[PDB]
Structure 1
Amino acid sequence: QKSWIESTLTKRECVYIIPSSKDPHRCLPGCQICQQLVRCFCGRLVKQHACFTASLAMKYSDVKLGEHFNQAIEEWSVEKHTEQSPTDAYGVINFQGGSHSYRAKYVRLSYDTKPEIILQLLLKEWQMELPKLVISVHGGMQKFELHPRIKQLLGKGLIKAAVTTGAWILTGGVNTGVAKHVGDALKEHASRSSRKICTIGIAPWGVIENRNDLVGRDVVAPYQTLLNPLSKLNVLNNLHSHFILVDDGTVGKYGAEVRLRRELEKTINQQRIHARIGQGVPVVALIFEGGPNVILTVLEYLQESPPVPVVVCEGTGRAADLLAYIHKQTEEGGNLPDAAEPDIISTIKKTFNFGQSEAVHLFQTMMECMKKKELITVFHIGSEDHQDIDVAILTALLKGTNASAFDQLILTLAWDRVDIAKNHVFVYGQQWLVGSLEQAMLDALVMDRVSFVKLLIENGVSMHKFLTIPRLEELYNTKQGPTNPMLFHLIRDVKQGNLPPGYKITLIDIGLVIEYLMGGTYRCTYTRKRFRLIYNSLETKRFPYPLNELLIWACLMKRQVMARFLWQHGEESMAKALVACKIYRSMAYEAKQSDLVDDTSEELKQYSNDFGQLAVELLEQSFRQDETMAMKLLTYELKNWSNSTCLKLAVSSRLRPFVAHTCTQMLLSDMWMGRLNMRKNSWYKVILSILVPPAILMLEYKTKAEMSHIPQSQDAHQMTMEKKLPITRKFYAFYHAPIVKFWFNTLAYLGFLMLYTFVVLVKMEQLPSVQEWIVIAYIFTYAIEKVREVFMSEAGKISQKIKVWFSDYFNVSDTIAIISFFVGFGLRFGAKWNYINAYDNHVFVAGRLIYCLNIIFWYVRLLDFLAVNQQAGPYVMMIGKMVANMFYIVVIMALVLLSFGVPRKAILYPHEEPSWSLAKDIVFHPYWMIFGEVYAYEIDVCANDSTLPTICGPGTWLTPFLQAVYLFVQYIIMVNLLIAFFNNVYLQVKAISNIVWKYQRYHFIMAYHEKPVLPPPLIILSHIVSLFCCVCKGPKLFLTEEDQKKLHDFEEQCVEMYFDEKDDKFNSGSEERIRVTFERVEQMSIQIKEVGDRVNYIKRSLQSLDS
């Protein structure tokens, strides 16, 4: 029937009508007054039942003929004579808008609803979250009027208890008594926190007004909140979210829900608070201004398994304050103080007039409520006692119901409340079991509870003894937390597609993910021989560096707040940040290349740039402390990250601000020098020493101690271990310096162009000249070296070597230049000569003309040599970026060109056959007009000074007007638009070009450590040796053990200085000092007004003691 409520829930009607006690009121003609006023013992009168069965019985006189044997008059029970029926009510009970819209729900169910059915209602149907706290408020109806001061504290404490725990608040529902003060607390401090606060009012379907207006199946009914003057009944409170309405008889009969509300508390406390915690949901009882039936409710909570605790307030003044006074004058669980019962029972009867007879009956309840003091928490207002009742609500669930501190701690873990756990669980004197704090850590890591991981580490948990292999197997294999939906896609990409449905993840599989993300020759510690054998066997079952293992975990599970926390703890801070920058970057690249409805690539790319910024800020901190030791931090092997290097990790991430940072640029500048001391040399001297080999020995070099921060080769280190440096060592130092390899290739390249310019300008005979064979020998041997750069570069995959190398500009240009040369040399050399006149062989012409065009590639390649300079380099990279940026302005200039050329050719040349010359003529002249050529005497072809007098004809007077418009658009609009484009894009392209230039000095300078000594006409001598030693049989930074110790102390010290100066800059800013002033002046305003009230309590005794 498209209604889950109708198949399960229940209305119920009083179908069998028993009249009232004896008496109809007045009005002698008795036959009419038995219908007009006589109520049913149901409670409603006889004309409102309508009783489809007994409607045929009311016509006789009524149901059930007369006197009915007085024992049988009482016989109406709601079980026997009150018949059940389907729904009649559910929908939205939207209150008339005050501050906001304020929707809510209702059900109208029976009394005999089973406890499993009512639990099934709240969770599944109404889409509510299973809570972590139930605050059942209880007090007295209709009494009223807290003070203004106490209204703020009890109001604020009830909210911050519920929004920080995600609690249900069970109220009476109706606006009398408690719920008026519960909702006014919601009026003050809402902050739209009804998403987290779910106040559930359990009222009856009785004393509520406008019950017949709520009649309806799936009806969004409006409901008014106007205080009805003539009436005395109660309305619902506007700031509730859900209503449960129970009817036993009818309007009046003010109790049916006391059992059902209490049975609801039993069902929640039997449900698990979380899918990892065996403890059940706690229930607390808050007591405002109370009553006579309240005392039976408080005692019914304490006498139960489990013993639900009770929180009692004071200051309101009723039975609430009786429980405050009775609990106060009482020590631990003995009978009484001195005999002051005439003072107690007198105080009981001033609340409600009992009169010494059953006021004694209240005292047996007051002596059982002073008995269980441990489960009673009184909140004394006026001495800031126990600090904001939300502490005292949550503390009351820890003092009584004796359980382990583990049970106290894991309860706070579900609430996500550390200030209760720090100040009331980790107190002095608390004794802990051996494995309890470890089980708390395992729960807190899965549940993404960062501030508890911080608390458990400070209170004794060691991650070294904690983080085992099977436990870290679990941390990946949880769905009981915020998981990454991307990790399972990464695992199937490295296991070739096999996916069983259960599939507990192994660490052999995670390592294959890390090696896939880090790329290159990265080898994780999971996929090596030592780990696989001890993984088969299952101390050695622990990890040496646990916080390296969890930092990867937090990144792969996309738990950034956990990752930032686990980064600060442990060693190798700048390295872990660069690894994390790479791991998120690779997952961001996999996210785009994957068919998911949730991209989450911009989230990972932001996370990659956060750790990248941390790496730069640690390098800046290390560079300010000591320049030389910071350059060592860039190049020492890490021994926990696949023997990699902080440069190699940042270059792998393409993290430009690290490579462009002034520390790496000093290191790159010093690797360029080699063992030459180019601070006290000159570039004149390096070039001179290439041409004059004996001039090498007059050059100042660097000592072994001036090179401890520079990585070297293995055999280059052997040269340094031994004015030092005898003769044959100084030749190795010179010719293997990258600066020398450069000029020794540059001078050979300039001599190459001088020859290849000579070849192409001078007449070519049949056989090549001596100059031309030197050219061929260069480009051939130059091509071999380019083949060697491809094969022997970085990445094991041969096709991946290809994709990197064709990504640079001049490497693609070299490929076209090398191929087209031998196409040209082939046509040139391998052609049948004529012997009568050259250039009657069109194959030889085509070969020569390729030389004339191929030489452009080799002059533009001088920009490639010019880009080594600090000033010229950024401009060369700038030219390319400006061409790409101005493309669409130039396209517009090309359409304006064709808009003019086509009509000019059409008007001036009306008698043309189809020819490809027409394509030339519509483009040619209008293009040269952009560049200054007006063609002054071809304008106005019918003039006397015209150089085209035969073109004069019909309508050629239009073309001067066309060309006037053309050049206005080209120079005056489009050329000046293009000047303006470059001006206003200059600074941000010059800036980008500086960083790109500085980034790519790494790949440039680290290439010259691997290039041979000898330039590309003579390099073939070096390729023979390279094949000789390979068939027959990069740089590292060496450190002794006392220099690794001094370096690790430097890395640790500079990280400590980083977080201290970061905290000192935040605490000393103007923004933070104003607000801490703001928060203290707020508290001082509270105290002085409250001390100002105490000193007014002093002057009452001044008038007394003056008397």
Structure 2
Amino acid sequence: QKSWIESTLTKRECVYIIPSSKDPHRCLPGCQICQQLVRCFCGRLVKQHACFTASLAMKYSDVKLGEHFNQAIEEWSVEKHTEQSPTDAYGVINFQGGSHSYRAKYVRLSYDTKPEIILQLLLKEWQMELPKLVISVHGGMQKFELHPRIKQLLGKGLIKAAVTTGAWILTGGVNTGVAKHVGDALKEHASRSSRKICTIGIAPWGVIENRNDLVGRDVVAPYQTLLNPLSKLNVLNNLHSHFILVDDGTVGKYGAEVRLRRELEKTINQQRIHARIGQGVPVVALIFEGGPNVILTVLEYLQESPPVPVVVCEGTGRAADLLAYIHKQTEEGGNLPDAAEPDIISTIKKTFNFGQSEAVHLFQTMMECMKKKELITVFHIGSEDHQDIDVAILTALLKGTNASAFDQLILTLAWDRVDIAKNHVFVYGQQWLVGSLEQAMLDALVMDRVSFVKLLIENGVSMHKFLTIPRLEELYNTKQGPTNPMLFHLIRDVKQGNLPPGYKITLIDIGLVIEYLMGGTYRCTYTRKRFRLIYNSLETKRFPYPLNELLIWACLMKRQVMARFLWQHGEESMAKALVACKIYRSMAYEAKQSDLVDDTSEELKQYSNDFGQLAVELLEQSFRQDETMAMKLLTYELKNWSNSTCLKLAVSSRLRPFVAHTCTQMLLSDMWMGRLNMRKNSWYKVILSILVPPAILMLEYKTKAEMSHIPQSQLPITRKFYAFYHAPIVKFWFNTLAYLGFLMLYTFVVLVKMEQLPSVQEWIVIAYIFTYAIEKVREVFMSEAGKISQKIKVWFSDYFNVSDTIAIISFFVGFGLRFGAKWNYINAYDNHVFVAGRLIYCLNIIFWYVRLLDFLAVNQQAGPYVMMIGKMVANMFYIVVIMALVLLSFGVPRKAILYPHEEPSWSLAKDIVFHPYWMIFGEVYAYEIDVCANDSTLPTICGPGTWLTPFLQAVYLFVQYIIMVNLLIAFFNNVYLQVKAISNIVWKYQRYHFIMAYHEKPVLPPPLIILSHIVSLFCCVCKGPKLFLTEEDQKKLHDFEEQCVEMYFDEKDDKFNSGSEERIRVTFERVEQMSIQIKEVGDRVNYIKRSLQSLDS
């Protein structure tokens, strides 16, 4: 079977053929007209029964008694005399002729289908989404008129209610009733425009025009949609999307649908509107020009439990306008206090021809409907209440259903409508039980509903008291919003093992992720012993700065719109942007370094650059507002961010525009110069004063008035010397001059013959490297406070520190061999322990020349070239691998052809690489190419096949010398162009690193540094740019920062609103409105001139 529609559903047929409601008919043909015009109660003439038994009722006699007593005439029903059977009509309508020939699923099923089977059909089979609202549109079932204004004024609003909520609209489907005008709303306003409306039409099958076409197993039945526009015929409206055509086994009688529609309303209102939201899907009724029975249908709702609100429209002067009339007459309680019944009874009969009797009984219904005037709503178009029927239909669920303030709020959340919640829920009158707004906040955060989170904070929600450890863990562990797949894998990486299957994320584990992502020596609060001794136990279970914690949450969960919102709220705004940049940057790197090929890394990199640019633009706001306070923002210790600074965080992210900003550079210049105040020509004034100490007194020094602000800060003769030598610019040149003297000596040592005992030059060289090594050990341990393992990893992340480490270790291996070698020989090169040591020195000196590139990179021009070279060498690997394969592809055949008598030796390795490598540089070995030529320098190599090798070398050089070298050059040219474009930015970032480096160094260079060591560690036993603010100036700085955040958004909005695109569009929208306003003059000007022609007489 494997077919749920066919297997489950049911079609009835009338098995039973009583005459047409009495004696068959007169007309002398008698038995003959019994074929022509004699039907059943079934609604079908004799040949339209067509049942297997009804055809045995076409041959001899019918299925009854001889004369068929009359309590069998009444005995026909659609319960006992109709046979259920699998269905026939279902598929997709093709409304051929209607505007792209719309499509709409359809099905023929009995009135007695169980309500759950219906729900299975709508949601499972048809793949419909469970809605967040159900609008049931009742109205007049007979072709009626509708004024042009109200037409386009209804179809703007009912559509928005079903489009802003995903509401199922419900109709009869057939165009004879209100469904025709629901279609008008759909045609105009381009009903969905990629934003589906589901409007089901539940109609009876026995009335459908062209019943036949739809018959067929899963058939695409087409359907004429252009019959006479006046002739009222039960023709399905071509703009609906779904049809449930209710069968009662009959033809030509309505009323089989009344239950199944209502049963569907019950069935949906007993479904959860959302996973967390514990309400039922709301239902509401809408009334467009109702007939008589529509009145009772209102009451039929107002009583039932739970009730159903009823929004009654106006216009057209029937049940719709009528209920609008009396709804203004009856009092607040619900009983007309005046004596004005015969006047409204008069009005009933002007709309419903009764005369007196049904008129009152029709009035008797309504006085009960006017009891429950809280579940009734009138949207009158004239004086324009509610501003919209959208909000009216929606607001009707909020008033009159005695719903808690919470239930009112959370339903707007499901719908994602703040405009209704702001205006209609948050208002004087609501009472708001103890923890309802907070539970609302949790739902809004979890569901990524930023607009409500905004609203809740404004309307009285404290994030300080809201945000707890349990609620924060519930936010990390949810799956009901935008998630980050990576986060689970980052937790699995920092938790070295695996996890039980239903592992719920812990904040300690988040803390370990944040430390991984921030790196260096960052330590999160969550990993600290205080928080642990709290957390293991679980005023203290709250957080002092919740908006810091939720920013981290939103970024780790890849919830960027929420992260941008939580950034602009709270304190520490520049830090939060810089932390966010680093977090996303590191996640981007993890994605890039994974084996997955996707767009996650470029997405996360973009998010990092978004917050990075916010931090730069905030720094420029602050700098233009107040330079001194801008510099304080760069330097204040961030207690909440591992005691770091915003400058250090920006450096951790390779955020060069922030570091290159003038404010940062001004800060760095003051550190570099110290108390020195030369504006020009400082390099040689410092050099000559290192070498001529009395020239120190001729230099310009800052006054204490100047050395007072310096927002990173921590004249007699003696203090001028102190000021000079403790200045980092001086420590640079003093270290530089000593380093150059070091190299000149060590160069002398390796070039000059080495004796038994080191020369005085060599001793000085040894002393330098030894004390330079002690310095490097101390730079690691007196580095940024952290774990020793973290300190180690950071310091070995620089190139020149790895090189210096190898340089230092190799030197003392070399010195040990050079110095501890016993001389069995007078020659001193017969001893090969000694020679090994000397050769290490000769290679070790390379490290020390290459370390001069780091000194030279202190210059603004040289520095970017040094970074170029590093990037060239670091990224050329794969081109060189290809070059090596090309080399061997030539080297191996050359050796094999030219030297065919070789036994295995390691000389084979040399010979296959050696000459081919030197060819890269243009050495062709001209007189070795053709070994059989007269001018050959290898005549003994002449032999069989040796004529091949010139052809091989011809190809090799073309590929190697021309193609491959110039590919490598092309790669290097791109590096040049990339770095040159950002050259000034590159040096300004380098400038941070060397100013910080020499700020922390001691005042003596590495030969004499030992005294600075030996004197300092006494003062600790015997007895960098970080501003330590008090809590009062800390609060002023936060106030400064929030002002500049406000000014940032203001300028952003002003720039946006001044842009030409924004001016074209507002003009566009505004000219459109005016074109109606002028037609509204062009319309009213008639009413003037024609009324003047009326008063002309």
TM-score range relative to shorter protein: 0.7 to 0.9
Q: CA deviation at 1:748?
A: 1.6
Q: CA deviation at 1:429?
A: 6.5
RMSD of aligned Cα (Å): 4.5
Q: CA deviation at 1:571?
A: 1.7
Aligned partners of 1:291 and 1:319 also within 8 Å: yes
Q: Deviations over 1:525-582 (max 9, x none)?
A: 4555665666688756654433334333433444322222222122221112222333
Q: Percent identity?
A: 100
Q: Indicate how the Cα distance of structure 1 residues 810 and 477 shifts in structure 2: closer, same or farther if over 3 A, else same.
A: closer
How many pairs align?
1097
Q: Indicate how the Cα distance of structure 1 residues 134 and 951 shifts in structure 2: closer, same or farther if over 3 A, else same.
A: closer
Q: Deviations over 1:229-275 (max 9, x none)?
A: 99975343333333222212322111200122122222333434334
Q: Indicate how the Cα distance of structure 1 residues 853 and 554 shifts in structure 2: closer, same or farther if over 3 A, else same.
A: closer
Q: Name the residue aligned to 1:345.
A: 345
Task: Tell me, in whole angstroms, the C-alpha distance in 2 between the residues paired with 1:519 and 1:950.
Answer: 65
Query: Is 1:895 matched up with 2:905?
Result: no
Task: Tell me, in whole angstroms, the C-alpha distance in 2 between the residues paired with 1:937 and 1:821.
Answer: 43
Aligned partners of 2:136 and 2:284 also within 8 Å: yes
Task: Tell me, in whole angstroms, the C-alpha distance in 2 between the residues paired with 1:892 and 1:464.
Answer: 60
Q: CA deviation at 1:1045?
A: 5.2
Q: Indicate how the Cα distance of structure 1 residues 510 and 783 shifts in structure 2: closer, same or farther if over 3 A, else same.
A: closer
Q: Name the residue aligned to 2:489.
A: 489
Q: Indicate how the Cα distance of structure 1 residues 437 and 872 shifts in structure 2: closer, same or farther if over 3 A, else same.
A: same
More displaced 10-residue stretch of structure 1: 825-834 or 949-958: 949-958
Aligned partners of 2:919 and 2:961 also within 8 Å: no
Task: Tell me, in whole angstroms, the C-alpha distance in 2 between the residues paired with 1:664 and 1:416.
Answer: 44
More displaced 10-residue stretch of structure 1: 1023-1032 or 641-650: 1023-1032
Task: Tell me, in whole angstroms, the C-alpha distance in 2 between the residues paired with 1:173 and 1:259.
Answer: 16
Task: Tell me, in whole angstroms, the C-alpha distance in 1 between the residues paired with 2:332 and 2:27.
Answer: 66
Aligned partners of 1:680 and 1:700 also within 8 Å: no
Q: CA deviation at 1:162?
A: 1.0
What does residue range 175-254 of structure 1 map to in structure 2 within 5 Å?
Answer: 175-190=175-190, 192=192, 196-216=196-216, 225=225, 227=227, 233-254=233-254
Q: Indicate how the Cα distance of structure 1 residues 461 and 707 shifts in structure 2: closer, same or farther if over 3 A, else same.
A: same
Q: Indicate how the Cα distance of structure 1 residues 903 and 541 shifts in structure 2: closer, same or farther if over 3 A, else same.
A: closer
Task: Tell me, in whole angstroms, the C-alpha distance in 1 between the residues paired with 2:530 and 2:877.
Answer: 57
Task: Tell me, in whole angstroms, the C-alpha distance in 2 between the residues paired with 1:51 and 1:788.
Answer: 103
Q: CA deviation at 1:878?
A: 0.9
Q: Deviations over 1:876-907 (max 9, x none)?
A: 11122234566666777778878888999999
Aligned partners of 2:110 and 2:248 also within 8 Å: yes
Task: Tell me, in whole angstroms, the C-alpha distance in 1 between the residues paired with 2:784 and 2:459.
Answer: 47
Q: CA deviation at 1:126?
A: 3.7
Aligned partners of 2:98 and 2:238 also within 8 Å: no
| Partner of residue 993 from structure 1, selected from 983, 987, 996 | 983
Q: Deviations over 1:1035-1057 (max 9, x none)?
A: 63244666545534432332232
Q: Deviations over 1:702-740 (max 9, x none)?
A: 344434555778xxxxxxxxxx95555444443333222
TM-score by length of 2: 0.87
More displaced 10-residue stretch of structure 1: 690-699 or 587-596: 587-596
Aligned partners of 1:132 and 1:281 also within 8 Å: yes
Say which SS state the counterpart of residue 377 (structure 1) adopts. Answer: strand
Q: Indicate how the Cα distance of structure 1 residues 497 and 952 shifts in structure 2: closer, same or farther if over 3 A, else same.
A: closer
Task: Tell me, in whole angstroms, the C-alpha distance in 1 between the residues paired with 2:471 and 2:1003.
Answer: 54
Q: CA deviation at 1:135?
A: 0.9
Query: Is 1:686 matched up with 2:686?
Result: yes
Structure 2: segments with no counterpart, 5+ residues: none
Aligned partners of 1:877 and 1:997 also within 8 Å: no
More displaced 10-residue stretch of structure 1: 345-354 or 676-685: 345-354
More displaced 10-residue stretch of structure 1: 1022-1031 or 732-741: 1022-1031
Q: Name the residue aligned to 2:827.
A: 837
What does residue range 406-421 of structure 1 map to in structure 2 within 5 Å?
Answer: 406-421=406-421
Q: CA deviation at 1:73?
A: 0.8
Q: CA deviation at 1:374?
A: 4.4
Q: CA deviation at 1:761?
A: 2.2
Q: Indicate how the Cα distance of structure 1 residues 645 and 97 shifts in structure 2: closer, same or farther if over 3 A, else same.
A: farther
More displaced 10-residue stretch of structure 1: 515-524 or 959-968: 959-968
Q: Deviations over 1:579-629 (max 9, x none)?
A: 233344455556678899999555444333322221121112122233333
Task: Tell me, in whole angstroms, the C-alpha distance in 1 between the residues paired with 2:744 and 2:376.
Answer: 101
Say which SS state the counterpart of residue 213 (structure 2) adopts. Answer: helix
Q: Deviations over 1:158-186 (max 9, x none)?
A: 11111112211011123333223223422
Aligned partners of 1:520 and 1:795 also within 8 Å: no
Q: Indicate how the Cα distance of structure 1 residues 355 and 531 shifts in structure 2: closer, same or farther if over 3 A, else same.
A: same
Aligned partners of 2:645 and 2:1026 also within 8 Å: no
Aligned partners of 1:273 and 1:279 also within 8 Å: yes
Q: Deviations over 1:29-79 (max 9, x none)?
A: 655654565323222244454555676676552211232212321111222
Say which SS state the counterpart of residue 365 (structure 2) adopts. Answer: helix
Q: CA deviation at 1:426?
A: 3.6
Q: Deviations over 1:512-537 (max 9, x none)?
A: 55455444554544555665666688
Q: CA deviation at 1:219?
A: 5.3
Aligned partners of 2:672 and 2:999 also within 8 Å: no
Aligned partners of 1:207 and 1:252 also within 8 Å: yes
More displaced 10-residue stretch of structure 1: 92-101 or 298-307: 92-101
Aligned partners of 1:901 and 1:922 also within 8 Å: yes
Q: Indicate how the Cα distance of structure 1 residues 457 and 979 shifts in structure 2: closer, same or farther if over 3 A, else same.
A: closer
Q: Indicate how the Cα distance of structure 1 residues 951 and 63 shifts in structure 2: closer, same or farther if over 3 A, else same.
A: closer
More displaced 10-residue stretch of structure 1: 416-425 or 523-532: 523-532
Q: CA deviation at 1:814?
A: 2.8
Task: Tell me, in whole angstroms, the C-alpha distance in 1 between the residues paired with 2:974 and 2:649.
Answer: 36
Q: Indicate how the Cα distance of structure 1 residues 994 and 94 shifts in structure 2: closer, same or farther if over 3 A, else same.
A: farther
More displaced 10-residue stretch of structure 1: 176-185 or 3-12: 3-12
Task: Tell me, in whole angstroms, the C-alpha distance in 1 between the residues paired with 2:641 and 2:923.
Answer: 65
Task: Tell me, in whole angstroms, the C-alpha distance in 2 between the residues paired with 1:117 and 1:688.
Answer: 97
Q: Indicate how the Cα distance of structure 1 residues 36 and 975 shifts in structure 2: closer, same or farther if over 3 A, else same.
A: same
Q: Indicate how the Cα distance of structure 1 residues 92 and 1004 shifts in structure 2: closer, same or farther if over 3 A, else same.
A: farther
More displaced 10-residue stretch of structure 1: 1047-1056 or 152-161: 1047-1056
Aligned partners of 1:550 and 1:566 also within 8 Å: yes
Structure 1: segments with no counterpart, 5+ residues: 714-723
Q: Indicate how the Cα distance of structure 1 residues 346 and 1045 shifts in structure 2: closer, same or farther if over 3 A, else same.
A: closer
More displaced 10-residue stretch of structure 1: 17-26 or 978-987: 978-987
Q: CA deviation at 1:1059?
A: 1.9
Aligned partners of 1:578 and 1:615 also within 8 Å: yes
Aligned partners of 1:881 and 1:989 also within 8 Å: no
Q: Indicate how the Cα distance of structure 1 residues 486 and 984 shifts in structure 2: closer, same or farther if over 3 A, else same.
A: closer
Aligned partners of 2:91 and 2:219 also within 8 Å: yes
Q: CA deviation at 1:1101?
A: 2.3
Q: Name the residue aligned to 2:954.
A: 964
Task: Tell me, in whole angstroms, the C-alpha distance in 1 between the residues paired with 2:100 and 2:656.
Answer: 51
TM-score by length of 1: 0.86
Q: Indicate how the Cα distance of structure 1 residues 927 and 194 shifts in structure 2: closer, same or farther if over 3 A, else same.
A: closer
Q: Indicate how the Cα distance of structure 1 residues 778 and 530 shifts in structure 2: closer, same or farther if over 3 A, else same.
A: closer
Aligned partners of 1:631 and 1:709 also within 8 Å: no
Q: CA deviation at 1:631?
A: 1.8
Q: CA deviation at 1:639?
A: 2.9
More displaced 10-residue stretch of structure 1: 571-580 or 1036-1045: 1036-1045
Say which SS state the counterpart of residue 898 (structure 1) adopts. Answer: helix
Aligned partners of 2:818 and 2:833 also within 8 Å: yes
Q: Indicate how the Cα distance of structure 1 residues 52 and 789 shifts in structure 2: closer, same or farther if over 3 A, else same.
A: farther
Task: Tell me, in whole angstroms, the C-alpha distance in 1 between the residues paired with 2:254 and 2:37.
Answer: 21
Aligned partners of 1:709 and 1:1037 also within 8 Å: no
Q: CA deviation at 1:1024?
A: 4.7
What does residue range 690-1089 of structure 1 map to in structure 2 within 5 Å?
Answer: 690-708=690-708, 710=710, 725-794=715-784, 796-831=786-821, 833=823, 837=827, 839-840=829-830, 844-883=834-873, 986-991=976-981, 995-1024=985-1014, 1034=1024, 1036-1039=1026-1029, 1043-1044=1033-1034, 1046-1089=1036-1079
Q: Deviations over 1:967-990 (max 9, x none)?
A: 888888777777666556533232
Q: CA deviation at 1:152?
A: 1.9
More displaced 10-residue stretch of structure 1: 897-906 or 600-609: 897-906
Aligned partners of 1:167 and 1:196 also within 8 Å: no
Q: Indicate how the Cα distance of structure 1 residues 177 and 598 shifts in structure 2: closer, same or farther if over 3 A, else same.
A: farther
Aligned partners of 1:12 and 1:84 also within 8 Å: yes
Q: Indicate how the Cα distance of structure 1 residues 609 and 1018 shifts in structure 2: closer, same or farther if over 3 A, else same.
A: same
Task: Tell me, in whole angstroms, the C-alpha distance in 1 between the residues paired with 2:333 and 2:711.
Answer: 77
